[PDB]
Each structure stands twice: as C-alpha cells, then as structure tokens.
Design an enzyme around this catalytic site. Structure first.
Site, short mmCIF file in Angstrom:
data_model
loop_
_atom_site.label_atom_id
_atom_site.label_comp_id
_atom_site.label_asym_id
_atom_site.label_seq_id
_atom_site.Cartn_x
_atom_site.Cartn_y
_atom_site.Cartn_z
N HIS A 2 -18.76 -58.38 53.04
CA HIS A 2 -18.61 -57.63 53.50
C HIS A 2 -19.37 -56.37 53.84
N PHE A 4 -20.53 -54.17 55.32
CA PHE A 4 -20.63 -53.04 55.58
C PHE A 4 -19.35 -52.57 54.68
N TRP A 5 -17.95 -52.91 54.79
CA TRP A 5 -17.17 -52.08 54.28
C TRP A 5 -17.53 -52.31 52.55
N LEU A 159 -10.57 -47.86 68.09
CA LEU A 159 -12.28 -48.77 68.76
C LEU A 159 -12.36 -50.03 69.61
N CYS A 160 -13.60 -50.05 70.02
CA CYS A 160 -13.86 -50.59 70.67
C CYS A 160 -15.34 -50.55 70.84
N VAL A 161 -15.69 -52.86 70.94
CA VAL A 161 -17.03 -52.09 71.18
C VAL A 161 -16.99 -53.06 72.19
N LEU A 170 -22.07 -53.13 65.54
CA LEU A 170 -22.24 -52.12 66.47
C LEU A 170 -21.15 -50.94 66.25
N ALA A 171 -19.85 -51.77 65.33
CA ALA A 171 -18.90 -50.62 64.48
C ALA A 171 -19.04 -49.88 63.66
N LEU A 411 -0.40 -44.51 67.97
CA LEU A 411 -0.05 -45.34 69.39
C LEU A 411 -0.86 -46.40 69.78
C1 LIG Z 1 -12.92 -38.96 56.57
C2 LIG Z 1 -13.34 -40.06 57.92
C3 LIG Z 1 -13.15 -40.89 58.16
C4 LIG Z 1 -13.48 -41.79 59.40
C5 LIG Z 1 -13.45 -43.66 59.30
C6 LIG Z 1 -12.14 -43.85 58.78
C7 LIG Z 1 -12.45 -45.39 58.92
C8 LIG Z 1 -12.68 -46.09 60.46
C9 LIG Z 1 -12.62 -47.32 60.78
C10 LIG Z 1 -11.78 -48.30 62.27
C11 LIG Z 1 -10.58 -48.44 62.17
C12 LIG Z 1 -10.57 -48.71 63.69
C13 LIG Z 1 -8.90 -49.27 64.23
C14 LIG Z 1 -8.83 -49.30 66.11
O1 LIG Z 1 -8.62 -49.57 66.47
S1 LIG Z 1 -8.17 -51.01 65.70
C15 LIG Z 1 -8.88 -51.91 67.50
C16 LIG Z 1 -9.19 -52.31 66.98
N1 LIG Z 1 -10.66 -52.60 68.39
C17 LIG Z 1 -10.50 -53.56 68.55
O2 LIG Z 1 -9.76 -55.05 68.12
C18 LIG Z 1 -11.04 -54.11 70.12
C19 LIG Z 1 -11.28 -55.60 70.33
N2 LIG Z 1 -12.90 -55.62 69.74
C20 LIG Z 1 -13.79 -55.08 69.51
O3 LIG Z 1 -13.62 -53.79 70.77
C21 LIG Z 1 -15.00 -55.48 68.60
O4 LIG Z 1 -14.57 -56.45 68.07
C22 LIG Z 1 -14.41 -54.27 67.55
C23 LIG Z 1 -15.11 -53.07 67.83
C24 LIG Z 1 -13.37 -54.10 66.46
C25 LIG Z 1 -15.43 -54.98 66.53
O5 LIG Z 1 -17.29 -54.68 67.15
P1 LIG Z 1 -17.83 -56.22 66.28
O6 LIG Z 1 -16.42 -57.05 66.53
O7 LIG Z 1 -18.45 -56.39 67.35
O8 LIG Z 1 -18.06 -56.12 64.96
P2 LIG Z 1 -19.91 -55.64 64.71
O9 LIG Z 1 -20.39 -56.89 64.19
O10 LIG Z 1 -20.30 -54.40 65.10
O11 LIG Z 1 -18.86 -54.91 62.88
C26 LIG Z 1 -18.74 -56.27 61.85
C27 LIG Z 1 -18.00 -55.50 60.80
O12 LIG Z 1 -16.91 -54.98 61.62
C28 LIG Z 1 -15.58 -54.31 61.08
N3 LIG Z 1 -14.89 -54.51 61.69
C29 LIG Z 1 -14.06 -55.63 62.67
N4 LIG Z 1 -12.74 -55.25 63.13
C30 LIG Z 1 -12.97 -53.63 62.89
C31 LIG Z 1 -11.76 -52.78 62.67
N5 LIG Z 1 -10.38 -54.02 63.55
N6 LIG Z 1 -11.58 -52.00 61.73
C32 LIG Z 1 -12.83 -51.93 61.31
N7 LIG Z 1 -13.45 -52.58 60.95
C33 LIG Z 1 -13.66 -53.88 61.54
C34 LIG Z 1 -15.70 -55.70 60.05
O13 LIG Z 1 -15.04 -56.45 59.14
C35 LIG Z 1 -17.47 -55.96 60.04
O14 LIG Z 1 -18.12 -55.41 58.87
P3 LIG Z 1 -18.08 -55.65 57.24
O15 LIG Z 1 -17.16 -56.71 57.26
O16 LIG Z 1 -19.15 -56.77 57.37
O17 LIG Z 1 -18.30 -55.35 56.10
C1 LIG Z 2 -3.68 -53.84 66.82
C2 LIG Z 2 -4.69 -52.76 66.16
N1 LIG Z 2 -4.44 -51.88 66.79
C3 LIG Z 2 -4.12 -51.60 67.72
C4 LIG Z 2 -3.17 -52.13 68.86
C5 LIG Z 2 -2.88 -51.57 69.91
C6 LIG Z 2 -2.18 -51.29 70.30
N2 LIG Z 2 -0.47 -52.37 69.02
C7 LIG Z 2 0.43 -51.17 69.10
C8 LIG Z 2 1.69 -52.16 69.04
C9 LIG Z 2 2.71 -51.27 68.54
C10 LIG Z 2 4.16 -51.89 68.21
C11 LIG Z 2 4.39 -53.01 68.39
C12 LIG Z 2 3.66 -53.75 68.68
C13 LIG Z 2 4.02 -55.03 69.25
C14 LIG Z 2 5.08 -55.92 69.06
C15 LIG Z 2 5.59 -57.08 69.69
C16 LIG Z 2 4.16 -57.42 69.91
C17 LIG Z 2 3.12 -57.44 70.04
C18 LIG Z 2 1.96 -58.74 70.68
N3 LIG Z 2 1.64 -57.68 71.79
C19 LIG Z 2 2.49 -57.93 72.61
C20 LIG Z 2 1.70 -57.68 74.40
C21 LIG Z 2 -0.09 -56.97 74.30
N4 LIG Z 2 -1.15 -57.22 74.65
C22 LIG Z 2 -2.28 -57.06 74.23
S1 LIG Z 2 -2.46 -58.28 73.09
C23 LIG Z 2 -0.36 -58.14 73.10
C24 LIG Z 2 0.51 -58.60 71.99
C25 LIG Z 2 3.04 -56.30 69.76
C26 LIG Z 2 2.61 -53.53 69.38
C27 LIG Z 2 -3.15 -53.56 68.16
MG LIG Z 3 -21.19 -54.96 67.61
#
Ligand SMILES: CCCCCCCCCCCCCC(=O)SCCNC(=O)CCNC(=O)[C@H](O)C(C)(C)COP(=O)(O)OP(=O)(O)OC[C@H]1O[C@@H](n2cnc3c(N)ncnc32)[C@H](O)[C@@H]1OP(=O)(O)O
Ligand SMILES: c1cncc(CCNCc2cccc(-c3cccc(CN4CCc5ncsc5C4)c3)c2)c1
Ligand SMILES: [Mg+2]
Length: 411
Positions: A2, A4-5, A159-161, A170-171, A411
């Site tokens: 990782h 980053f992490w 979080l969304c790229v 970029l994340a 949410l």
């Molecule tokens: C005190 C204040 C602090 C505030 C900040 C607190 C932390 C908040 C942290 C965020 C909480 C989010 C909560 C939610 O919203 S969870 C919802 C996340 N969104 C999605 O899944 C939507 C669809 N996917 C995407 O948009 C992209 O694939 C994302 C943006 C997820 C990654 O973009 P991409 O796929 O283009 O990758 P990269 O090359 O840019 O980056 C690679 C790095 O990113 C690490 N990675 C992958 N997925 C996640 C993930 N869900 N949380 C944290 N990190 C994640 C991965 O392990 C790797 O690092 P390392 O393994 O190399 O070390």
């Molecule tokens: C993962 C990481 N961060 C955020 C999310 C998006 C919001 N998901 C939150 C959530 C909260 C509570 C329950 C569920 C859930 C429960 C049963 C089954 C499911 C499964 N999903 C159903 C519909 C759907 N739409 C896009 S993917 C998907 C699959 C979710 C999902 C998912």
């Molecule tokens: Mg990226």
C-alpha cells in the site's frame, strides 16, 4: 503493498489492531499552525475546486459524476444514483463546513473528475465496553476513559474518481487534500466506511435485503427465483405470496414525524444510541435535519400514544441505475436509517417500516447488521446480501468491535 495507506495514521494490520487496548489518537499531536497554508501541489491541467452546495449547477455536477462513476455491485449490474435533493441533504447538515467538500476539475473545461465529501459528526468513540472491563481487571480505568467524551470529527463519504482517471493515484491526492482542509479546522480524526478491505477496520458487517416487489427484483436480476421454488408448480405467485405485506401499518399511533416531535425523538434516539460503543450525538437541529420527512429522500414515522412519542423509525431512498434492462431503468431501494423502540418489540416497529416502504413504491429494503438490525432479520424475512460494509477511523486507535456495537448509519 500500500504505497499510500502505509504512510497514513491508521493501524496497519489485524495484529496491530488486536493489541490496541485504548481509544486514542495514532499520530503526533499536531497544530493548525503546522499545516501547509496552500493546497497540495497538483498537475497544471487540473485544479482544486470547492463546490458551492447552494448552487444548483454545482450540485448537478457532483450528481452526474456520481451517477456515472460511483459504487457498482461486483457484477456491474447496478450503480447508485443518489439524487440531487439527496446530495444537498447529505452534504449540508447544520454547521457543515463548505471547505471540506473537495473536488478536482479539469481546467480547460471545468469537467468534474473527482470528488470527496467531509461533514461534521459528533461521535462517541471512547474505549468500548468489553475493553473497559479488561481495563478494570488491570487497574487501568483512567487511561481507558480518557477519550470518553463525544468528539467533533469529520465523516467522509462520496469518494469518486471518474472512470477515465482510474488507477492514476488520484484518490490518495484527494484524500491528502481533504485531510489538510479538515486539519486546518482543528479536526484530527475522521470516520468512513467502505466495501473494500483497507488497513484496518474496527468493525465489519454483512448487508441484508428484504424484497418488497419480488417480480421487479427478479426481472432486473437483483434476485433469482431460488431453487426450492422450482419444486413448485408456480414459482412467482409463491414468491409474491411469501413477501406480501399489509396495506396499512399495524401500529395504531403511527403517523409521519412533524417538527413538533423533534425533542421527543432526540430524547428517545439518544437514550437508545447510548447502548452502543460508537455512535453519533445529535442536537435538535441535527435531528430536524436528518429525520424530518423530505419528499423523495428521507421518510420518518413516530408512534404516538396519549400525546407522547414512544417509538419511531426512519428510512432513506437511494435509487440505483440498472445497467441494460429493457423493462426497468431503476431499482427503488429504501435503507433502514435511525429508529428507537420503547413500547413494542423492534420487529413489530420495523414491520411497519416495510409496510410503509412497500405502499410508497419501493422495491427492496436494505441495511447493514449495525444497531439491533439482527433482531428482526428472520421474522421480517431479510436475507444476507453479498459482501460486507467495513467501518474505519483515520488517526484513531480502536479495539475491534462487533457491528452490533456500531450505531453510526452512513448514507
Ligand atoms: C482528519 C481528516 C481525515 C479525512 C480523510 C480520512 C480518510 C478517508 C479515506 C476515503 C474514505 C472513502 C469512503 C468512501 O467513499 S467508500 C466509496 C468509494 N467510492 C467508490 O468505490 C466509487 C467507485 N470507485 C472509484 O471512484 C475509485 O476506484 C476510487 C476513488 C475508490 C479509487 O480510485 P482509483 O481506483 O482510481 O485508485 P487510485 O490509483 O486513485 O488510488 C489507489 C489507492 O486508493 C486506495 N483506495 C481504493 N479504494 C479506496 C477507498 N474506497 N477508500 C480509501 N482508499 C481507497 C487504494 O487502496 C490505493 O492506495 P494503496 O493501497 O496504494 O495504499
Ligand atoms: C459501499 C461503500 N460505500 C458506500 C456504498 C454506497 C451506499 N451503500 C450503502 C448501503 C447501506 C446499507 C445497505 C446496503 C445494501 C444492502 C443490501 C444489498 C446491497 C447491495 N447493493 C444493492 C443496490 C446496489 N446499487 C449499486 S451496487 C448495489 C448492490 C446494499 C448498502 C457502498
Ligand atoms: Mg486515479
């Protein structure tokens, strides 16, 4: 593994986690004045952007980025489609900090390429009950109780790229910049959830779903007609009969929540959420914001008897895009939100949730096994779904807890 992490103030393994005994920070105490004044450096073709959440166009830009690029299921059949009204609700609670919503735009045309949102939450996150017991037995009570007080921290979501920019690191850059903006406001901890496994969760729970319109769910392949219903002459009639619900709530006393209910709902909710190790503390303004009914977004009903609110439940709507079905464009899902039961068994209160959701045209009721959500799964015919929602802190050591000790709905 990782790049980053491994650089971040989080526990790096399950072993490290397993040796954590007290709640508290991971990092060097730091001050505001330590933190770089200037946004993190970024490529000369991108620019940082702070959306104005009272601008409809800004909300629309975030809306389209998430509609097309946010979380999908593992088979790319569904993608969440949070509405514009939902996003304004989720992103703008009382005293939200505009600067905590961080975006990257492409300079040339202001195309939104990535987003992350932070909002305030007041969270109980001190040492859990089971670890406090172990601390008594060791003579270590004060150290265990040090961070007992609710803390004003950041809750991260959305979080969304953009798909065309995936896997270019970029994340991390978005996460560093969010972190800077939060730290500049003297906040040092964050809570976030994910369905992927990252270092290192403090709790993990299954998802559950309860079919409301099984004919649609089967048609979109959210659900199958399960194998056992084939030994039946007629599968679907049996499936519909299985999941049928009354037309009207069974609890006399049940009505929609109105603003005058805010104080009683605050009281019953906070009393209830006390029974959990990690949980939000809400002001009357926060209760009003998160629980008062909003058309198309959040739905909340109270049980009132002899002019007193005794029980309530809430659910919110998130529709999902169905990727390529000729009959259906959308899955209309209800998500169990906060609730509190004092007069009736929780299963009887949530049954009214299902009845309301069903009457209002929702297709399925979903949830994570947080709170006491397990006490109603079997009676209310919830089934376990695929995967798990994991809960995490940024900069906070925390012993592993059961998801039934978690009271924060994300949410
Ligand atoms: C005190 C204040 C602090 C505030 C900040 C607190 C932390 C908040 C942290 C965020 C909480 C989010 C909560 C939610 O919203 S969870 C919802 C996340 N969104 C999605 O899944 C939507 C669809 N996917 C995407 O948009 C992209 O694939 C994302 C943006 C997820 C990654 O973009 P991409 O796929 O283009 O990758 P990269 O090359 O840019 O980056 C690679 C790095 O990113 C690490 N990675 C992958 N997925 C996640 C993930 N869900 N949380 C944290 N990190 C994640 C991965 O392990 C790797 O690092 P390392 O393994 O190399 O070390
Ligand atoms: C993962 C990481 N961060 C955020 C999310 C998006 C919001 N998901 C939150 C959530 C909260 C509570 C329950 C569920 C859930 C429960 C049963 C089954 C499911 C499964 N999903 C159903 C519909 C759907 N739409 C896009 S993917 C998907 C699959 C979710 C999902 C998912
Ligand atoms: Mg990226």
């Amino acid at each position: 593994a990782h790049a980053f992490w491994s650089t971040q103030p989080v526990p790096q393994t399950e072993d490290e986690t397993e040796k954590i005994v007290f709640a508290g920070p991971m990092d060097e105490p730091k001050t505001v004045a330590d933190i770089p004044e200037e946004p993190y450096p970024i490529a000369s073709t991108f620019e940082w952007w702070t959306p104005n959440m009272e601008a409809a166009d800004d909300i629309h830009a975030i809306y389209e980025l998430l509609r097309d690029n946010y979380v999908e299921d593992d088979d790319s059949m569904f993608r969440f489609n949070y509405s514009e009204e939902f996003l304004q609700w989720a992103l703008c609670p009382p005293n939200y900090i505009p600067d905590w919503h961080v975006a990257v735009r492409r300079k040339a045309d202001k195309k939104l390429l990535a987003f992350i949102a932070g909002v305030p939450v007041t969270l109980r996150m001190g040492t859990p009950k089971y670890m406090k017991v172990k601390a008594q037995e060791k003579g270590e009570g004060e150290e265990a109780a040090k961070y007992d007080e609710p803390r004003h921290i950041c809750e991260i979501n959305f979080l969304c790229v953009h798909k065309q920019l995936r896997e270019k690191r970029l994340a991390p850059i978005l996460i560093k910049e969010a972190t800077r903006r939060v730290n500049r406001t003297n906040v040092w901890q964050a809570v976030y959830t994910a369905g992927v496994l990252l270092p290192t969760p403090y709790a993990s729970g299954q998802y559950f779903h309860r079919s409301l319109n099984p004919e649609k769910l089967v048609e979109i392949r959210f659900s199958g007609i399960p194998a056992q219903y084939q030994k039946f002459q007629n599968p679907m009639a049996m499936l519909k009969r299985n999941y049928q619900l009354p037309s009207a709530p069974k609890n006399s006393g049940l009505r929609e929540m109105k603003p005058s209910d805010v104080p009683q709902v605050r009281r019953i909710l906070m009393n209830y959420l006390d029974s959990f190790d990690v949980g939000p503390v809400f002001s009357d303004a926060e209760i009003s914001h998160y629980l008062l009914p909003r058309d198309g977004v959040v739905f909340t009903y109270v049980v009132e008897n002899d002019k007193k609110v005794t029980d309530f439940f809430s659910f919110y709507r998130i529709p999902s895009t169905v990727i390529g079905n000729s009959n259906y464009n959308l899955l209309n899902a209800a998500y169990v939100h906060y609730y509190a039961a004092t007069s009736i068994p929780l299963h009887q209160l949530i049954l009214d949730l299902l009845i309301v959701a069903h009457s209002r045209g929702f297709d399925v009721c979903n949830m994570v096994e947080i709170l006491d959500n397990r006490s109603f799964v079997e009676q209310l015919k919830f089934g376990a779904g695929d995967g798990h929602l994991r809960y995490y802190f940024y900069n906070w050591a925390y012993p592993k807890i059961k998801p039934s000790q978690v009271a924060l709905v994300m949410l």
